[PDB]
């Protein structure tokens, strides 16, 4: 059962945020140059309050949230977002993450209805399902949860990082790389997406990835501690050319 | 809240050039692709050009391809159209728009400006 | 290039009449058709997307359906405020195109 429940955008500065491990190869004590879809440094990221519009997916999405009450539960990814095409639904409940790809007929304004227990009010039907996956929760001071969503050659790739945050209303400064979470062999197009919130009877940020060249610094324990955006400015370009921070 | 304002119209001579611009506000301009559409007096709508959100790929209608250039500056929330070798047949009202598109731009909302008149004579 | 056409080029109807407008494509464009309504002096307004999905704020008297190469736009009961030129647009492939436009007059 669906229930029928526009402000200007706010912006924040993704200072040096949204960098993920480009592959699963171990490297240490080395500067590695790679080209991939990354969030540009110091970009203007759209700030929403958990206000739940349908957004473009473009070439991939950087999604971050700051909350202490688990309001954001999942995402809807697809094109038409109705029964005409296959759509990807990712939701997290108290014990498991449920991922399905079906011809969903989504509600005009989808959400989870929380009374402890909850009822899903996301879609009225789910026909011709092609993919299903179940595992441990993706989501489970304030908690900062960062995700990167890519869709390349039929594979929906998710990267994530979870840290404590002590800021009031913005993104933190400093470097933290996101690790691979899951790689789903789905084979569908994604052009638009929407966020699923838990509403009882928190804010998030959305940025977009670009084909950028990065210089990644791996420390002695094989983790990334810094990075240079080679197209940010003339100094960063010099640093990349000489492979030297 | 959402506005699109065209400017740079006016009267030019055949073989000349004119640079149009569109100021965007009230929405996340830097996340959306943008279109130019023109409408000659007494005629229907004609699609002119499309540019992706990152200012990367550019597409043109056959009738303007090779003469018109589409560009944007996401730091100024401004869309541009540079028209060279203008012909008498290019007389039209030019609109900037964010057209609803479930395949290419991923736009869920449809926005249009008021349009600016370009006359070639 | 996918070429679009519409029929009739113009029609006259009175208030309460049912009005149907046909849009066709030279190529199969599945369901990726937009319908616009333009009044003189104003920019076009989107009424229907994805062939049959109504835009928020659009009166329930408007509807549409179809797929492939043959689409229909319908007004179940024409109102005096519905006198406008209607255009169909395909966005299945670039370049995007608009149809000739169907002019609805007041009988
Ligand atoms: C979270 O969602 C999963 C969906 O898989 C729930 O697990 C299923 O629960 C139904 C009963 O409603 C069983 O018939 C299925 O066999 C279960 N599937 C699996 C893989 O265990 C899970 O119970 C939900 N958790 C909560 C708290 O609602
Ligand atoms: C929500 O709106 C849709 C579209 O008008 C309608 O079909 C549906 O019955 C409404 N649901 C409720 C609970 O009002
Ligand atoms: C971000 O927005 C500010 C205006 O608030 C602008 O001055 C700055 O150049 C923009 N930066 C980028 C990368 O767009
Ligand atoms: C699955 O798709 C086919 C069309 O290929 C359709 O006829 C069928 O009804 C769909 N299945 C369901 C449960 O709707
Ligand atoms: C998915 O994208 C590919 C590449 O553009 C296209 O050929 C295909 O028709 C699309 N399918 C759907 C259902 O959009
Ligand atoms: C690497 O790990 C060791 C513990 O084995 C730790 O003492 C050291 O500080 C770590 N180095 C970095 C750069 O984190």
PDB file of N, CA and C in Angstrom, chain A residues 87-171:
ATOM      1  N   UNK A  87      14.415  -2.460 -12.389  1.00  0.00           N
ATOM      2  CA  UNK A  87      14.980  -1.480 -11.470  1.00  0.00           C
ATOM      3  C   UNK A  87      15.633  -2.166 -10.279  1.00  0.00           C
ATOM      4  N   UNK A  88      16.653  -1.524  -9.729  1.00  0.00           N
ATOM      5  CA  UNK A  88      17.419  -2.055  -8.609  1.00  0.00           C
ATOM      6  C   UNK A  88      17.013  -1.447  -7.275  1.00  0.00           C
ATOM      7  N   UNK A  89      16.580  -2.302  -6.358  1.00  0.00           N
ATOM      8  CA  UNK A  89      16.162  -1.864  -5.036  1.00  0.00           C
ATOM      9  C   UNK A  89      17.094  -2.388  -3.952  1.00  0.00           C
ATOM     10  N   UNK A  90      17.744  -1.474  -3.236  1.00  0.00           N
ATOM     11  CA  UNK A  90      18.639  -1.848  -2.147  1.00  0.00           C
ATOM     12  C   UNK A  90      18.111  -1.327  -0.822  1.00  0.00           C
ATOM     13  N   UNK A  91      17.726  -2.231   0.073  1.00  0.00           N
ATOM     14  CA  UNK A  91      17.217  -1.809   1.375  1.00  0.00           C
ATOM     15  C   UNK A  91      17.878  -2.546   2.529  1.00  0.00           C
ATOM     16  N   UNK A  92      18.054  -1.844   3.640  1.00  0.00           N
ATOM     17  CA  UNK A  92      18.631  -2.432   4.840  1.00  0.00           C
ATOM     18  C   UNK A  92      17.630  -2.461   5.989  1.00  0.00           C
ATOM     19  N   UNK A  93      17.348  -3.670   6.514  1.00  0.00           N
ATOM     20  CA  UNK A  93      16.522  -3.805   7.699  1.00  0.00           C
ATOM     21  C   UNK A  93      17.404  -4.192   8.904  1.00  0.00           C
ATOM     22  N   UNK A  94      16.785  -4.494  10.041  1.00  0.00           N
ATOM     23  CA  UNK A  94      17.507  -4.687  11.305  1.00  0.00           C
ATOM     24  C   UNK A  94      18.548  -5.812  11.271  1.00  0.00           C
ATOM     25  N   UNK A  95      18.397  -6.778  10.365  1.00  0.00           N
ATOM     26  CA  UNK A  95      19.303  -7.928  10.373  1.00  0.00           C
ATOM     27  C   UNK A  95      20.028  -8.184   9.051  1.00  0.00           C
ATOM     28  N   UNK A  96      19.446  -7.760   7.934  1.00  0.00           N
ATOM     29  CA  UNK A  96      20.003  -8.097   6.624  1.00  0.00           C
ATOM     30  C   UNK A  96      19.841  -6.992   5.589  1.00  0.00           C
ATOM     31  N   UNK A  97      20.686  -7.040   4.561  1.00  0.00           N
ATOM     32  CA  UNK A  97      20.519  -6.178   3.399  1.00  0.00           C
ATOM     33  C   UNK A  97      19.887  -6.974   2.277  1.00  0.00           C
ATOM     34  N   UNK A  98      18.836  -6.424   1.702  1.00  0.00           N
ATOM     35  CA  UNK A  98      18.102  -7.111   0.658  1.00  0.00           C
ATOM     36  C   UNK A  98      18.209  -6.370  -0.660  1.00  0.00           C
ATOM     37  N   UNK A  99      18.760  -7.038  -1.659  1.00  0.00           N
ATOM     38  CA  UNK A  99      18.916  -6.429  -2.964  1.00  0.00           C
ATOM     39  C   UNK A  99      18.152  -7.204  -4.023  1.00  0.00           C
ATOM     40  N   UNK A 100      17.247  -6.520  -4.708  1.00  0.00           N
ATOM     41  CA  UNK A 100      16.447  -7.157  -5.744  1.00  0.00           C
ATOM     42  C   UNK A 100      16.396  -6.333  -7.015  1.00  0.00           C
ATOM     43  N   UNK A 101      16.350  -7.016  -8.152  1.00  0.00           N
ATOM     44  CA  UNK A 101      16.136  -6.345  -9.426  1.00  0.00           C
ATOM     45  C   UNK A 101      14.901  -6.919 -10.106  1.00  0.00           C
ATOM     46  N   UNK A 102      13.863  -6.087 -10.236  1.00  0.00           N
ATOM     47  CA  UNK A 102      12.555  -6.501 -10.734  1.00  0.00           C
ATOM     48  C   UNK A 102      11.888  -5.364 -11.495  1.00  0.00           C
ATOM     49  N   UNK A 103      10.779  -5.661 -12.154  1.00  0.00           N
ATOM     50  CA  UNK A 103       9.990  -4.610 -12.774  1.00  0.00           C
ATOM     51  C   UNK A 103       9.070  -4.022 -11.721  1.00  0.00           C
ATOM     52  N   UNK A 104       9.655  -3.197 -10.860  1.00  0.00           N
ATOM     53  CA  UNK A 104       8.946  -2.625  -9.734  1.00  0.00           C
ATOM     54  C   UNK A 104       8.039  -1.502 -10.181  1.00  0.00           C
ATOM     55  N   UNK A 105       6.844  -1.463  -9.620  1.00  0.00           N
ATOM     56  CA  UNK A 105       5.986  -0.308  -9.797  1.00  0.00           C
ATOM     57  C   UNK A 105       6.068   0.524  -8.536  1.00  0.00           C
ATOM     58  N   UNK A 106       6.968   1.494  -8.545  1.00  0.00           N
ATOM     59  CA  UNK A 106       7.291   2.243  -7.343  1.00  0.00           C
ATOM     60  C   UNK A 106       6.189   3.227  -6.992  1.00  0.00           C
ATOM     61  N   UNK A 107       6.064   3.520  -5.696  1.00  0.00           N
ATOM     62  CA  UNK A 107       5.122   4.504  -5.178  1.00  0.00           C
ATOM     63  C   UNK A 107       5.540   5.911  -5.604  1.00  0.00           C
ATOM     64  N   UNK A 108       4.587   6.836  -5.610  1.00  0.00           N
ATOM     65  CA  UNK A 108       4.886   8.219  -5.972  1.00  0.00           C
ATOM     66  C   UNK A 108       5.885   8.830  -5.000  1.00  0.00           C
ATOM     67  N   UNK A 109       5.853   8.357  -3.761  1.00  0.00           N
ATOM     68  CA  UNK A 109       6.748   8.828  -2.715  1.00  0.00           C
ATOM     69  C   UNK A 109       7.040   7.685  -1.741  1.00  0.00           C
ATOM     70  N   UNK A 110       7.988   6.801  -2.083  1.00  0.00           N
ATOM     71  CA  UNK A 110       8.306   5.553  -1.412  1.00  0.00           C
ATOM     72  C   UNK A 110       9.044   5.786  -0.103  1.00  0.00           C
ATOM     73  N   UNK A 111       8.763   4.952   0.892  1.00  0.00           N
ATOM     74  CA  UNK A 111       9.442   5.041   2.181  1.00  0.00           C
ATOM     75  C   UNK A 111       9.210   3.797   3.029  1.00  0.00           C
ATOM     76  N   UNK A 112       9.900   3.730   4.163  1.00  0.00           N
ATOM     77  CA  UNK A 112       9.650   2.679   5.141  1.00  0.00           C
ATOM     78  C   UNK A 112       8.872   3.245   6.323  1.00  0.00           C
ATOM     79  N   UNK A 113       7.777   2.580   6.676  1.00  0.00           N
ATOM     80  CA  UNK A 113       6.889   3.020   7.748  1.00  0.00           C
ATOM     81  C   UNK A 113       7.254   2.342   9.064  1.00  0.00           C
ATOM     82  N   UNK A 114       7.776   3.114  10.014  1.00  0.00           N
ATOM     83  CA  UNK A 114       8.279   2.543  11.263  1.00  0.00           C
ATOM     84  C   UNK A 114       7.314   2.758  12.430  1.00  0.00           C
ATOM     85  N   UNK A 115       6.910   1.662  13.067  1.00  0.00           N
ATOM     86  CA  UNK A 115       6.022   1.784  14.243  1.00  0.00           C
ATOM     87  C   UNK A 115       6.862   1.463  15.475  1.00  0.00           C
ATOM     88  N   UNK A 116      11.180  -0.169  16.005  1.00  0.00           N
ATOM     89  CA  UNK A 116      10.875  -1.580  16.354  1.00  0.00           C
ATOM     90  C   UNK A 116      10.550  -2.348  15.072  1.00  0.00           C
ATOM     91  N   UNK A 117       9.266  -2.492  14.753  1.00  0.00           N
ATOM     92  CA  UNK A 117       8.846  -3.150  13.516  1.00  0.00           C
ATOM     93  C   UNK A 117       8.545  -2.109  12.451  1.00  0.00           C
ATOM     94  N   UNK A 118       8.570  -2.529  11.191  1.00  0.00           N
ATOM     95  CA  UNK A 118       8.300  -1.616  10.090  1.00  0.00           C
ATOM     96  C   UNK A 118       7.609  -2.307   8.925  1.00  0.00           C
ATOM     97  N   UNK A 119       6.979  -1.503   8.077  1.00  0.00           N
ATOM     98  CA  UNK A 119       6.330  -1.978   6.866  1.00  0.00           C
ATOM     99  C   UNK A 119       6.871  -1.241   5.650  1.00  0.00           C
ATOM    100  N   UNK A 120       7.189  -1.982   4.600  1.00  0.00           N
ATOM    101  CA  UNK A 120       7.718  -1.366   3.393  1.00  0.00           C
ATOM    102  C   UNK A 120       6.607  -0.789   2.537  1.00  0.00           C
ATOM    103  N   UNK A 121       6.743   0.483   2.180  1.00  0.00           N
ATOM    104  CA  UNK A 121       5.799   1.136   1.292  1.00  0.00           C
ATOM    105  C   UNK A 121       6.569   1.733   0.130  1.00  0.00           C
ATOM    106  N   UNK A 122       7.222   0.860  -0.621  1.00  0.00           N
ATOM    107  CA  UNK A 122       8.145   1.272  -1.662  1.00  0.00           C
ATOM    108  C   UNK A 122       7.547   1.043  -3.041  1.00  0.00           C
ATOM    109  N   UNK A 123       6.886  -0.095  -3.205  1.00  0.00           N
ATOM    110  CA  UNK A 123       6.309  -0.481  -4.483  1.00  0.00           C
ATOM    111  C   UNK A 123       5.002  -1.234  -4.288  1.00  0.00           C
ATOM    112  N   UNK A 124       4.152  -1.207  -5.313  1.00  0.00           N
ATOM    113  CA  UNK A 124       2.888  -1.931  -5.283  1.00  0.00           C
ATOM    114  C   UNK A 124       3.010  -3.317  -5.913  1.00  0.00           C
ATOM    115  N   UNK A 125       4.053  -3.515  -6.716  1.00  0.00           N
ATOM    116  CA  UNK A 125       4.287  -4.799  -7.375  1.00  0.00           C
ATOM    117  C   UNK A 125       5.753  -4.972  -7.752  1.00  0.00           C
ATOM    118  N   UNK A 126       6.158  -6.221  -7.977  1.00  0.00           N
ATOM    119  CA  UNK A 126       7.528  -6.541  -8.374  1.00  0.00           C
ATOM    120  C   UNK A 126       7.551  -7.747  -9.302  1.00  0.00           C
ATOM    121  N   UNK A 127       7.302  -7.509 -10.581  1.00  0.00           N
ATOM    122  CA  UNK A 127       7.145  -8.592 -11.545  1.00  0.00           C
ATOM    123  C   UNK A 127       8.453  -8.924 -12.257  1.00  0.00           C
ATOM    124  N   UNK A 128       8.564 -10.147 -12.794  1.00  0.00           N
ATOM    125  CA  UNK A 128       9.673 -10.558 -13.652  1.00  0.00           C
ATOM    126  C   UNK A 128      11.035 -10.263 -13.014  1.00  0.00           C
ATOM    127  N   UNK A 129      11.237 -10.731 -11.776  1.00  0.00           N
ATOM    128  CA  UNK A 129      12.496 -10.534 -11.053  1.00  0.00           C
ATOM    129  C   UNK A 129      13.640 -11.323 -11.684  1.00  0.00           C
ATOM    130  N   UNK A 130      14.788 -10.667 -11.838  1.00  0.00           N
ATOM    131  CA  UNK A 130      15.938 -11.284 -12.490  1.00  0.00           C
ATOM    132  C   UNK A 130      17.128 -11.493 -11.555  1.00  0.00           C
ATOM    133  N   UNK A 131      17.178 -10.742 -10.460  1.00  0.00           N
ATOM    134  CA  UNK A 131      18.320 -10.825  -9.551  1.00  0.00           C
ATOM    135  C   UNK A 131      17.903 -10.676  -8.096  1.00  0.00           C
ATOM    136  N   UNK A 132      18.502 -11.486  -7.228  1.00  0.00           N
ATOM    137  CA  UNK A 132      18.289 -11.358  -5.793  1.00  0.00           C
ATOM    138  C   UNK A 132      19.559 -11.676  -5.016  1.00  0.00           C
ATOM    139  N   UNK A 133      19.854 -10.841  -4.027  1.00  0.00           N
ATOM    140  CA  UNK A 133      21.033 -10.999  -3.183  1.00  0.00           C
ATOM    141  C   UNK A 133      20.727 -10.619  -1.740  1.00  0.00           C
ATOM    142  N   UNK A 134      21.157 -11.454  -0.798  1.00  0.00           N
ATOM    143  CA  UNK A 134      20.975 -11.150   0.617  1.00  0.00           C
ATOM    144  C   UNK A 134      22.268 -11.356   1.393  1.00  0.00           C
ATOM    145  N   UNK A 135      22.630 -10.371   2.206  1.00  0.00           N
ATOM    146  CA  UNK A 135      23.834 -10.460   3.026  1.00  0.00           C
ATOM    147  C   UNK A 135      23.701  -9.628   4.292  1.00  0.00           C
ATOM    148  N   UNK A 136      24.835  -9.260   4.882  1.00  0.00           N
ATOM    149  CA  UNK A 136      24.838  -8.456   6.099  1.00  0.00           C
ATOM    150  C   UNK A 136      24.588  -6.986   5.755  1.00  0.00           C
ATOM    151  N   UNK A 137      24.009  -6.202   6.675  1.00  0.00           N
ATOM    152  CA  UNK A 137      23.664  -4.801   6.515  1.00  0.00           C
ATOM    153  C   UNK A 137      24.840  -3.954   6.047  1.00  0.00           C
ATOM    154  N   UNK A 138      24.569  -3.046   5.114  1.00  0.00           N
ATOM    155  CA  UNK A 138      25.577  -2.120   4.611  1.00  0.00           C
ATOM    156  C   UNK A 138      25.768  -0.967   5.583  1.00  0.00           C
ATOM    157  N   UNK A 139      24.680  -0.575   6.232  1.00  0.00           N
ATOM    158  CA  UNK A 139      24.681   0.578   7.127  1.00  0.00           C
ATOM    159  C   UNK A 139      25.103   0.222   8.557  1.00  0.00           C
ATOM    160  N   UNK A 140      24.731  -0.980   9.012  1.00  0.00           N
ATOM    161  CA  UNK A 140      24.988  -1.440  10.378  1.00  0.00           C
ATOM    162  C   UNK A 140      26.148  -2.430  10.397  1.00  0.00           C
ATOM    163  N   UNK A 141      28.389  11.364  19.541  1.00  0.00           N
ATOM    164  CA  UNK A 141      28.806  11.683  18.182  1.00  0.00           C
ATOM    165  C   UNK A 141      27.785  11.157  17.169  1.00  0.00           C
ATOM    166  N   UNK A 142      28.033  11.422  15.879  1.00  0.00           N
ATOM    167  CA  UNK A 142      27.187  10.951  14.783  1.00  0.00           C
ATOM    168  C   UNK A 142      27.964   9.991  13.897  1.00  0.00           C
ATOM    169  N   UNK A 143      27.247   9.179  13.133  1.00  0.00           N
ATOM    170  CA  UNK A 143      27.881   8.234  12.226  1.00  0.00           C
ATOM    171  C   UNK A 143      27.943   8.775  10.807  1.00  0.00           C
ATOM    172  N   UNK A 144      29.147   8.834  10.247  1.00  0.00           N
ATOM    173  CA  UNK A 144      29.320   9.244   8.860  1.00  0.00           C
ATOM    174  C   UNK A 144      29.480   8.027   7.967  1.00  0.00           C
ATOM    175  N   UNK A 145      28.528   7.839   7.067  1.00  0.00           N
ATOM    176  CA  UNK A 145      28.543   6.694   6.171  1.00  0.00           C
ATOM    177  C   UNK A 145      28.714   7.143   4.731  1.00  0.00           C
ATOM    178  N   UNK A 146      29.804   6.713   4.112  1.00  0.00           N
ATOM    179  CA  UNK A 146      30.112   7.116   2.749  1.00  0.00           C
ATOM    180  C   UNK A 146      29.993   5.946   1.793  1.00  0.00           C
ATOM    181  N   UNK A 147      29.345   6.184   0.659  1.00  0.00           N
ATOM    182  CA  UNK A 147      29.184   5.179  -0.383  1.00  0.00           C
ATOM    183  C   UNK A 147      29.541   5.719  -1.760  1.00  0.00           C
ATOM    184  N   UNK A 148      30.076   4.853  -2.605  1.00  0.00           N
ATOM    185  CA  UNK A 148      30.267   5.181  -4.013  1.00  0.00           C
ATOM    186  C   UNK A 148      29.577   4.158  -4.893  1.00  0.00           C
ATOM    187  N   UNK A 149      28.697   4.639  -5.762  1.00  0.00           N
ATOM    188  CA  UNK A 149      27.924   3.771  -6.636  1.00  0.00           C
ATOM    189  C   UNK A 149      28.341   3.919  -8.094  1.00  0.00           C
ATOM    190  N   UNK A 150      28.860   2.841  -8.672  1.00  0.00           N
ATOM    191  CA  UNK A 150      29.271   2.839 -10.074  1.00  0.00           C
ATOM    192  C   UNK A 150      28.496   1.782 -10.844  1.00  0.00           C
ATOM    193  N   UNK A 151      28.323   1.986 -12.144  1.00  0.00           N
ATOM    194  CA  UNK A 151      27.628   1.002 -12.968  1.00  0.00           C
ATOM    195  C   UNK A 151      28.365   0.796 -14.288  1.00  0.00           C
ATOM    196  N   UNK A 152      29.319  -0.131 -14.292  1.00  0.00           N
ATOM    197  CA  UNK A 152      30.192  -0.317 -15.446  1.00  0.00           C
ATOM    198  C   UNK A 152      30.121  -1.725 -16.016  1.00  0.00           C
ATOM    199  N   UNK A 153      29.826  -1.808 -17.309  1.00  0.00           N
ATOM    200  CA  UNK A 153      29.761  -3.076 -18.027  1.00  0.00           C
ATOM    201  C   UNK A 153      28.812  -4.065 -17.364  1.00  0.00           C
ATOM    202  N   UNK A 154      27.703  -3.556 -16.844  1.00  0.00           N
ATOM    203  CA  UNK A 154      26.676  -4.399 -16.250  1.00  0.00           C
ATOM    204  C   UNK A 154      26.893  -4.653 -14.762  1.00  0.00           C
ATOM    205  N   UNK A 155      28.045  -4.252 -14.239  1.00  0.00           N
ATOM    206  CA  UNK A 155      28.336  -4.488 -12.833  1.00  0.00           C
ATOM    207  C   UNK A 155      28.062  -3.260 -11.984  1.00  0.00           C
ATOM    208  N   UNK A 156      27.236  -3.436 -10.958  1.00  0.00           N
ATOM    209  CA  UNK A 156      26.952  -2.356 -10.032  1.00  0.00           C
ATOM    210  C   UNK A 156      27.889  -2.484  -8.846  1.00  0.00           C
ATOM    211  N   UNK A 157      28.843  -1.572  -8.766  1.00  0.00           N
ATOM    212  CA  UNK A 157      29.914  -1.670  -7.788  1.00  0.00           C
ATOM    213  C   UNK A 157      29.693  -0.707  -6.638  1.00  0.00           C
ATOM    214  N   UNK A 158      29.754  -1.225  -5.419  1.00  0.00           N
ATOM    215  CA  UNK A 158      29.574  -0.384  -4.248  1.00  0.00           C
ATOM    216  C   UNK A 158      30.821  -0.376  -3.378  1.00  0.00           C
ATOM    217  N   UNK A 159      31.273   0.823  -3.030  1.00  0.00           N
ATOM    218  CA  UNK A 159      32.380   1.012  -2.098  1.00  0.00           C
ATOM    219  C   UNK A 159      31.837   1.717  -0.869  1.00  0.00           C
ATOM    220  N   UNK A 160      32.439   1.496   0.296  1.00  0.00           N
ATOM    221  CA  UNK A 160      31.933   2.160   1.491  1.00  0.00           C
ATOM    222  C   UNK A 160      32.972   2.385   2.583  1.00  0.00           C
ATOM    223  N   UNK A 161      32.665   3.336   3.465  1.00  0.00           N
ATOM    224  CA  UNK A 161      33.462   3.607   4.656  1.00  0.00           C
ATOM    225  C   UNK A 161      32.583   4.143   5.782  1.00  0.00           C
ATOM    226  N   UNK A 162      32.829   3.679   7.003  1.00  0.00           N
ATOM    227  CA  UNK A 162      32.090   4.155   8.167  1.00  0.00           C
ATOM    228  C   UNK A 162      33.012   4.675   9.262  1.00  0.00           C
ATOM    229  N   UNK A 163      32.872   5.959   9.590  1.00  0.00           N
ATOM    230  CA  UNK A 163      33.646   6.566  10.668  1.00  0.00           C
ATOM    231  C   UNK A 163      32.733   7.410  11.563  1.00  0.00           C
ATOM    232  N   UNK A 164      33.108   7.625  12.828  1.00  0.00           N
ATOM    233  CA  UNK A 164      32.578   8.632  13.734  1.00  0.00           C
ATOM    234  C   UNK A 164      32.852  10.042  13.222  1.00  0.00           C
ATOM    235  N   UNK A 165      31.906  10.948  13.446  1.00  0.00           N
ATOM    236  CA  UNK A 165      32.087  12.354  13.105  1.00  0.00           C
ATOM    237  C   UNK A 165      31.575  13.265  14.223  1.00  0.00           C
ATOM    238  N   UNK A 166      32.303  14.351  14.478  1.00  0.00           N
ATOM    239  CA  UNK A 166      31.944  15.289  15.540  1.00  0.00           C
ATOM    240  C   UNK A 166      31.635  16.691  15.017  1.00  0.00           C
ATOM    241  N   UNK A 167      31.187  16.780  13.772  1.00  0.00           N
ATOM    242  CA  UNK A 167      30.837  18.063  13.177  1.00  0.00           C
ATOM    243  C   UNK A 167      29.330  18.256  13.151  1.00  0.00           C
ATOM    244  N   UNK A 168      28.902  19.511  13.114  1.00  0.00           N
ATOM    245  CA  UNK A 168      27.483  19.831  13.196  1.00  0.00           C
ATOM    246  C   UNK A 168      26.741  19.711  11.867  1.00  0.00           C
ATOM    247  N   UNK A 169      27.275  20.318  10.809  1.00  0.00           N
ATOM    248  CA  UNK A 169      26.519  20.391   9.562  1.00  0.00           C
ATOM    249  C   UNK A 169      27.374  20.441   8.300  1.00  0.00           C
ATOM    250  N   UNK A 170      28.452  19.669   8.251  1.00  0.00           N
ATOM    251  CA  UNK A 170      29.281  19.660   7.050  1.00  0.00           C
ATOM    252  C   UNK A 170      30.125  18.394   6.959  1.00  0.00           C
ATOM    253  N   UNK A 171      30.871  18.265   5.869  1.00  0.00           N
ATOM    254  CA  UNK A 171      31.787  17.148   5.692  1.00  0.00           C
ATOM    255  C   UNK A 171      33.127  17.475   6.343  1.00  0.00           C
TER     256      UNK A 171
END
